[PDB]
Write a protein that binds this DNA or RNA. Structure first.
Lengths: 52, 133, 48, 94, 125, 52, 180, 123
RNA sequence: GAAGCUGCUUUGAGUGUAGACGAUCGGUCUAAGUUCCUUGGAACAGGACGUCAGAGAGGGUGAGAACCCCGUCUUUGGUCGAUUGGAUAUGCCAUAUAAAGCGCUUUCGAAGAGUCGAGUUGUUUGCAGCUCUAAAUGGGUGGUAAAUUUCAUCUAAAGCUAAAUAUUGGCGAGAGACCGAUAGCGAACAAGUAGAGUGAUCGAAAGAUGAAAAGAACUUUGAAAAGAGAGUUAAAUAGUACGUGAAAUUGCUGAAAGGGAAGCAUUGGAAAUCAG
RNA sequence: UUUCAAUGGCCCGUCUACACGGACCAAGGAGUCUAGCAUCUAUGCGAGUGUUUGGGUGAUGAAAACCCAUCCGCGAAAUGAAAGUGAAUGCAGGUGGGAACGCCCUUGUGGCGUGCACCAUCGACCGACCCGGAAGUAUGGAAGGGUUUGAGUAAGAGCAUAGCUGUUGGGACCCGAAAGAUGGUGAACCAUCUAGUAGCUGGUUCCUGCCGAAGUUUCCCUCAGGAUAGCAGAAACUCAGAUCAGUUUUAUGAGUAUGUAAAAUGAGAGUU
RNA sequence: GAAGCUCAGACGAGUAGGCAGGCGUGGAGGUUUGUGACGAAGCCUUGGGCGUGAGCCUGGGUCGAACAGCCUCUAGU
RNA sequence: AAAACUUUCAGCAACGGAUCUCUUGGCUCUCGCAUCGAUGAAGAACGCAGCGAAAUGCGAUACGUAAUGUGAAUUG
C-alpha cells in the first residue's frame, strides 16, 4: 500500500503516483450483456445458424 | 472500419459489448458510439469540464439530470473554480478532472456503467471533442 | 476490500490477516507490459 | 525491427512569460484557495507571479469577486482595472 | 553462483587456464579422492597424487584393479599403473592412462611433507 | 555494424510504473499463474503471504 | 568524431567511490564545505537564491573570524566578490554564525583546549552541511492587507511615462543645458 | 479481475496448457473436457466446470466453487469413480443435472473413451 | 601590505616502543554418493535410494556430473609473513631571550616597455612581418551617453598549482542478444610466416583420426611403391590423402531410349514399385 | 519412377529484332545504421508534459531495476520592422443549419427540440495601418470612426515513448572512369588521403491474395523537370436525392446538328 | 479459438505502383514434466503424406552430440 | 536392326571439400594501472637444448645461475 499507493491517494514511497484507474468499471461483460437492464430492452433475437 | 486498431483488451470489451447493443437494438446512439470507439486517437479529441459545464447550462439549459456522454478524455479546466454537480460518462478522466467532479459535484461513469444505466442512451447528451486540435 | 491469511513456517494458517492492497485492483494489460518489457529488456545490451 | 520492414518483402522484386487573470487563482496552494476565496476576510491573499516565472500579467478572463493583491513586474493596461472591481489591489514589484 | 569480480565464468578462459597450466598447478588438478577408511582416518577428502601411491580404479574398463602409480604423466593429464597395460600389436606392452579423478587412494606414500599437508588440512596424522 | 546503433530505448516513467503494477496485480490471479506455467495446483492462497 | 556514452554507469560508479574514498579519508570533517547565499546576476534569475563560491572579506570581518582561521576550519573565502546590500551582509553573517555554532574544533596537541576550540571530542560526526545549513529561497509574503493607496496608484502613471521620462531624459537634459 | 479479461489474456495467445499447430489449437489443461480452447470450455478463464481423467483403472472428476475460487489448494475437489462404465455414466449425468448442461454431451462422451482404454488396455 | 600603537591567542620542518586502522603481494584452510539395476567400449545417460547448499557460476574427467576433481559460497574472513597509510597512546630530545594572526593607524604604499597601442601586409577578432611608439587614477574592457561622455568592471606585457576531463597505444582484468574457419584481426595451425618486388612496400594458403596410437605384428605376391589376407578398435562406412562427406565431375554394373538434337507440359499404355 | 505415342512448347536475364551477360557446381553476395524533419497508428499523462546531464540505492551478481532533484525544452498568446502593445461582446454569442439523444403525438414517421464536433456565415475581441487627441505625470494616452490587416482570442491541447511510411545528410543498395594531393622508393613506382567526383553500365535474393494507371493533360519554368490533372487510391462528413451520366428523347431560341431547360434510361450519388 | 459460427449474391488478365496475409534463417526472453548415444544435427533416397504456393511432416540408409514446437524480441535473415 | 557410341535413370566406387556439430581465436564494450633509454633502450645479427629443424626461453654462467615457495619430476 505504501509502495503503489492507490487509485485515489498518492503513494507514500512514490511521489505523486496514483494507481491508474480502469477504462471499464466492470470487466464481466457477459453478466452485463445477460443482465436484466439489457436483456429486457433488446429486440427479438434473430435466428442462429439457419437452414439453406 | 470494422474493428479498433488498438490492442487494449479493456477497449475490446467495450467494442464487444457495444457491437451487441448496436446489432440487437435499434438505438442509433449505440451505433454512434460503436463508430466512434473504432476511431483513432486523434479523431477522438479531449473535452473539458468547462466545455461540458457550458454545454449543460446553455441557453434554455434543458440538462437537469441528463448524463453527459463523450467517447474520449475529459480533461480539467483550471480557469473555472466553481464546478456544478454533473454526471459524466467517458472512456477516461484525468486525475484532476475526476477529483474536481467527485469532491464538489455528482458522479463519474465509464461507458459500461452507462450501458447498465441507459442502454438505449435515454436522456443523454452525446458531446464530441474539438477536432480543430 | 477482502483480506488474506498469512501462513507460518510450519505451513499452518496463522491467526492474523491482512487487508488486500489496492495494487491488486489495477487493470491487467498484457499488451502494455509486453511493450514495456520489449523496451526494458534492451537496456542491458552491450554493444558489438 | 527489420523483420517488419519493407526490405523483407521485396526479395525477388529487385524575457517576459505571460499570465492572464483566468490563471492567478490557480497559482495559489490549494489550501490558500480553499480558505481565502469567497470568504469576507479582512486580509486578502497575495499573488507573486514572479515566483511562478511570469513577467507580465495580462488581463484575459473573468475574475472571482474575492479581493486579492497581485505582485508583478509589468501589467497590461486592462489587467489592473479588472482587479479594481474584483476588490483586490495591484502593486508593482521593483 | 560466483560473486567475486575476479573469477571467470567464461568457458573460453576456463579451458585456456586448464589446458595451459604449468606443472606446479597441474599437480593440483591431479587430485584424487581418498577411500572411505583413510578418509575417516585423516578427516581429509582428497590429495594430489604422487608416485608410488597405492590406489584402486573406480571407473572405466580397468575398474577394480589396484596398483601403484609408476609415474604421473602431468602433461597428458594421465596416471600410469603397473600391470595396467595394453598388449601392443607386435608383442610389446604399453600401459594405459587412468585420469586422476577416476582413481582412489588406498595407501598413501606417507612422508614428512605429506604429513604436514595432512595436518595442515585440519586433519589428524 | 557500428557501435553507435541505438541500443537503449526510453520509456515513459509513468508507463513503467503502470506495467509494474499490472504485473503485480496479475501475480494475484491464479488463472494467470497457471497459464504462465507455475504449478500452483496445491498452493493455499494466491496471493501467498508467509510470516515475518 | 563520434562520442559514445557506454561508460555512463561506469563513470557514475567512479564518482561514488571517489566520494566514499574521499569522505572516509577525512571522516571527522564534513565532506562538503559551506557556501554563501548568493543571488544570480540577471533579470531572469535575480529573484532566486543559490550557493556562491565563498564569503567576502566583509562577512568574515563581521563574523569575528580571520581570513586565515576561516580557511583552516573549512570556510571558503572569496576575494573577488564584494557584498553591497547589507542584507547580503546579513544573510551570510548568521550563516557563518550558525556554522560556527554547530562547529566543533578538535584541540591540537593531545586534546588540551586552546582558545575556544572545544572540549568534547567524542562528538565526532560527519554530517551533510546542507542538512544543518540548507539554502532557502526568498521569503515571500502572505496575507497583507489594505494598500488602497496603491489602489489609486494606477500603474502606468509610473510605468508608461517614467519609461518615456527615462527615454527622453537625455534629450531633456541636453535641452536644459542648451538654453541655459 | 474478471473472467473475460482473463480469457483475453491467456486464452487467445499464451497458455501453458495450449497447443498450436498448423492452423488448430488444443487445450491440454487437465480440467477441460472437450480438450479444445474456447471461452465456453476454458479451464483457467471460466468459473466452475466439470471434467474427468484416468488413473490406473478408474476415473475421477474435477469441479470448482465460486466462493473458494481464491484458494487454489481446495479450489478443485476430487471425486472418484471405480465401479462400472455404465454406472459412471448415470453418476456423471446426475452430478450435472443441477448444473448447466452445455458440457454433458462432451463430458459423458469423454468417459466412455477413457473406459474404452481399460478394455483395450486389457486386450 | 610596510612602519608605529594594543592585549588576547597560539607554536617542533624532530626521535624509539605498544595497540588499532587500512593497501598489496607471498603462502595456507574450505559441504555433501562416486551406493545399487538396465543400455553402453566408457555412465557423466535412464531408474531406485540418499546427501550438501552463504556452495544449483564455470571448467575437467572415455556421452547432459551440485555431491570424482579443480573450483564456486562463507571471503568486506581466519591464519601467517613482509613491508608499509598516517593517525592513538607512550618515551626521549627540542630549544622557545622566540615569531606570527587580529583592535588601531598620525602614511606610506613602490606594482612587470619595442610592451600596450596605431597604421600597414599576410593568414586562420587572434597571431605574424614591417615603420612609428606610449602613459600614471594611468591602462584594458564594456553598459551608457554622446561620437564624446559619464558609469561599471579588471589591473596585461613575470610565474606555480591537485580534482572533475581525454585515451583506436602499453600492461593487467571482467564481460557480450557479437563472428563461428571464404566468417571473425592479414594471422584459431610453423602469421607479418612461406613468398613476391632492386627498393619503398606487399603478403597468403592451412582447424577437426580415436576414449587411448592401441598408428596395422605376422604371412604371401611384387625389385619397390603398394596389394591380399590377417591384427588393433565400440567403429577402419575413423588408416595420418584421417569427424560428418553435398553438388559439379569421372568410371563400372543394371535398365531404357535414339534415322539430322534434347530438355518441358497434358492424356493414357507398358514395366517397376508403393499405398490404403 | 522410367519410357513410348498423340498434341502443344523459340533460351534465360537486362536494356532498346537485336545487341549485352551466361561452361558447370558449392559457399559468400547488394535499400544497411544514424541524425533531422513530416504524416499516420498505438501507449502514458493532460494544461501540462519529459528526469536516465546529475544524486541516492542496488554486492550478491550491479553496465540492470528502483527512487529523488524540473535548471531547462516544447506547449499554455498573439501582433509589429522594432520600440512596444499584447486577445470571451452577448448563457465566452448570435445567424442559419447541423451528432446522437432526449422529446413526443406516448407509436414511430414526422416533428418538438437540443445543439456536440462542427459547418458556414456573421456580431464582435487583441496587434498592426489611418483619423482623432477624455485624461493623467514637453510627455502621454483614452472614448470614438474605419470593413485594410492575422492559417489571431472567443471557454486552451499539447508533451513524451515505440512502430510504419516518405524525404533530406552522412560511404548511404551493391559494383565499376581518367584523374589530384601528401609523404616516400628507384633511376617510374609505393602507401595513405579515398569507401571520390558515377548527371551512367551492370546486378539487386521467398510465396500467395487484393487494388491497379500513365503517356497526354494543368500551368510553370534557367534546366531537366516538375507540376497539376487524370488514374489508382488512403482517412472524415453531407443528401435517400433529379444527386449524377463518354446516352437518347422532347421543348425552346439562333441559322440533321447548336446550346439551354425538361422526359427516357442506368446507378446511391458528393466531396474538401 | 465474438479474432468464432452461419446464410446469401456477385466477381476473378495485369506493367509502374498501392495493400494484406503467410513460408524460411541466425541469436534473445518465456513456455512445452519438450526430442536425444535404445542415436541429436547433418547428408542421401525409383519410399510415403500435406499445402494453390513459399515450404512442412515421415519411412529406409549413412551418421555421431546436440536440437526443436509455441508466444514474443531481434537481424550481417 | 545386335554390339559399340551418345543420352537418361538407379546402385556402387572415385573426385571434391560443401553442410552440420564444435573452438586455448578474433571483434566489441567496460574496468584498473603508469613502468623505456648513455647505469646503453626499441630493433637487428650470431650463438646457447643430449638428440630440435619448429615456437618460446636464454647470452660463453647462454631453453639459464643465486634466493624464496611448492614438494618428487622431465617426456617423442
Amino acid at each position: 500500500d505504501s509502495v503503489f499507493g492507490s487509485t485515489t491517494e498518492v503513494a507514500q514511497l512514490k511521489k505523486n503516483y496514483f494507481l491508474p484507474e480502469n477504462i471499464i468499471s466492470n470487466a464481466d461483460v457477459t453478466r452485463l450483456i445477460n443482465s436484466d437492464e439489457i436483456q429486457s430492452i433488446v429486440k427479438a433475437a434473430g435466428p442462429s445458424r439457419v437452414k439453406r | 472500419r470494422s474493428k479498433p486498431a488498438s490492442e487494449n483488451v479493456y477497449l475490446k470489451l467495450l467494442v464487444k459489448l457495444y457491437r451487441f447493443l448496436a446489432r440487437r437494438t435499434d438505438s442509433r446512439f449505440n451505433k454512434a458510439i460503436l463508430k466512434r470507439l473504432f476511431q483513432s486517437k486523434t479523431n477522438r479529441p479531449p473535452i473539458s469540464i468547462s466545455k461540458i459545464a457550458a454545454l449543460t447550462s446553455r441557453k434554455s439549459a434543458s440538462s437537469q439530470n441528463k448524463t453527459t456522454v463523450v467517447v474520449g478524455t475529459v480533461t480539467d479546466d483550471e480557469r473555472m473554480l466553481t464546478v456544478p454537480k454533473l454526471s459524466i460518462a467517458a472512456l477516461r478522466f484525468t486525475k484532476s478532472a475526476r477529483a474536481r467532479i467527485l469532491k464538489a459535484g455528482g458522479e463519474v461513469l465509464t461507458l459500461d456503467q452507462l450501458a447498465l444505466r441507459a442502454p438505449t442512451g435515454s436522456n443523454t447528451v452525446l458531446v464530441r471533442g474539438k477536432k480543430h486540435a | 476490500r477482502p483480506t488474506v491469511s498469512i501462513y507460518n513456517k510450519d505451513g499452518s494458517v496463522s491467526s492474523e490477516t491482512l487487508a488486500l492492497p489496492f495494487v491488486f485492483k489495477a487493470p491487467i494489460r498484457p499488451d502494455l507490459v509486453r511493450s514495456v518489457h520489449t523496451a526494458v529488456a534492451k537496456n542491458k545490451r552491450q554493444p558489438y | 525491427p527489420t523483420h517488419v520492414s519493407k526490405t523483407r518483402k521485396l526479395r525477388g522484386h529487385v524575457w517576459r512569460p505571460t499570465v492572464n487573470l483566468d490563471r492567478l487563482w490557480t497559482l495559489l496552494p490549494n489550501e490558500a484557495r480553499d480558505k481565502y476565496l469567497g470568504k469576507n476576510t479582512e486580509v486578502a491573499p497575495v499573488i507573486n507571479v514572479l515566483q511562478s516565472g511570469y513577467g507580465k500579467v495580462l488581463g484575459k478572463g473573468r475574475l472571482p469577486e474575492t479581493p486579492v493583491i497581485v505582485q508583478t513586474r509589468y501589467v497590461s493596461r486592462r489587467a489592473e482595472e479588472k482587479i479594481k472591481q474584483a476588490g483586490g489591489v495591484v502593486e508593482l514589484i521593483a | 553462483m560466483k560473486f567475486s569480480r575476479d573469477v571467470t565464468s567464461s568457458r573460453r578462459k576456463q579451458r585456456k587456464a586448464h589446458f595451459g597450466a604449468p606443472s606446479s598447478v597441474r599437480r593440483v588438478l591431479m587430485s584424487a579422492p581418498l577411500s572411505k577408511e583413510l578418509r575417516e582416518q585423516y578427516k581429509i577428502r582428497s590429495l594430489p597424487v604422487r608416485r608410488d601411491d597405492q590406489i584402486t580404479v573406480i571407473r572405466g574398463s580397468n575398474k577394480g584393479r589396484e596398483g601403484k602409480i609408476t609415474s604421473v604423466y602431468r602433461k597428458k593429464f594421465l596416471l600410469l599403473i603397473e600391470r595396467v597395460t595394453r598388449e601392443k600389436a607386435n608383442g610389446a606392452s604399453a600401459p594405459v592412462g587412468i585420469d586422476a579423478s577416476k582413481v582412489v587412494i588406498t595407501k598413501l606414500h606417507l612422508d614428512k611433507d605429506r604429513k604436514d599437508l595432512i595436518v595442515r588440512k585440519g586433519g589428524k596424522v | 555494424t557500428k557501435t553507435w546503433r541505438k541500443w537503449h530505448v526510453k520509456v515513459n516513467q509513468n508507463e513503467k510504473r503502470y506495467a509494474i503494477a499490472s504485473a503485480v496485480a496479475a501475480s494475484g490471479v491464479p488463472s494467470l499463474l497457471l497459464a504462465r506455467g507455475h504449478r500452483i495446483e496445491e498452493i493455499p492462497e494466491v496471493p501467498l503471504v508467509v510470516d515475518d | 568524431y563520434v562520442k559514445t556514452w557506454f561508460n555512463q554507469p561506469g563513470r557514475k560508479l567512479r564518482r561514488r567511490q571517489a566520494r566514499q574514498t574521499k569522505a572516509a579519508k577525512i571522516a571527522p570533517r564534513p565532506v562538503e564545505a559551506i557556501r554563501p547565499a548568493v543571488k544570480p546576476p540577471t533579470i531572469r534569475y535575480n529573484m532566486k537564491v543559490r550557493a556562491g563560491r565563498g564569503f567576502t572579506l566583509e562577512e568574515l570581518k563581521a563574523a569575528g573570524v580571520s581570513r586565515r582561521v576561516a580557511s583552516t576550519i573549512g570556510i571558503p573565502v572569496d576575494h573577488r566578490r564584494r557584498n553591497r546590500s547589507e542584507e547580503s551582509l546579513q544573510r551570510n553573517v548568521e550563516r557563518i554564525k550558525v556554522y560556527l555554532a554547530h562547529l566543533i574544533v578538535f584541540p591540537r596537541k593531545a586534546g588540551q583546549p586552546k582558545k575556544g576550540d572545544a572540549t568534547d571530542v567524542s562528538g565526532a560526526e560527519q554530517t551533510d552541511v546542507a542538512a544543518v545549513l540548507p539554502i532557502t529561497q526568498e521569503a515571500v509574503e502572505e496575507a497583507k492587507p489594505i494598500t488602497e493607496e496603491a489602489k489609486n496608484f494606477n500603474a502606468f502613471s509610473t510605468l508608461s511615462n517614467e519609461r518615456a521620462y527615462a527615454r527622453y531624459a537625455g534629450a531633456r537634459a541636453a535641452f536644459q543645458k542648451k538654453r541655459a | 479481475q474478471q473472467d473475460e479479461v482473463i480469457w483475453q489474456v491467456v486464452g487467445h495467445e499464451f497458455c501453458s496448457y495450449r497447443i498450436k499447430g498448423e492452423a488448430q489449437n488444443f487445450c491440454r489443461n487437465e480440467y477441460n473436457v472437450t480438450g479444445l480452447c474456447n471461452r465456453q470450455s476454458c479451464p483457467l478463464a471460466n468459473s466452475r466446470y466439470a471434467t474427468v481423467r484416468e488413473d490406473n483403472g478408474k476415473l475421477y472428476l474435477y469441479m470448482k466453487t465460486i466462493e473458494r475460487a481464491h484458494f487454489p489448494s481446495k479450489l478443485w475437489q476430487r471425486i472418484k469413480l471405480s465401479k462400472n462404465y455404465a454406472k459412471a455414466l448415470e453418476q456423471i449425468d446426475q452430478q450435472l443435472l443441477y448444473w448447466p448442461g452445455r458440457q454433458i454431451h462432451r463430458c459423458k462422451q469423454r468417459l466412455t473413451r477413457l473406459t474404452q482404454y481399460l478394455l483395450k488396455a486389457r486386450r
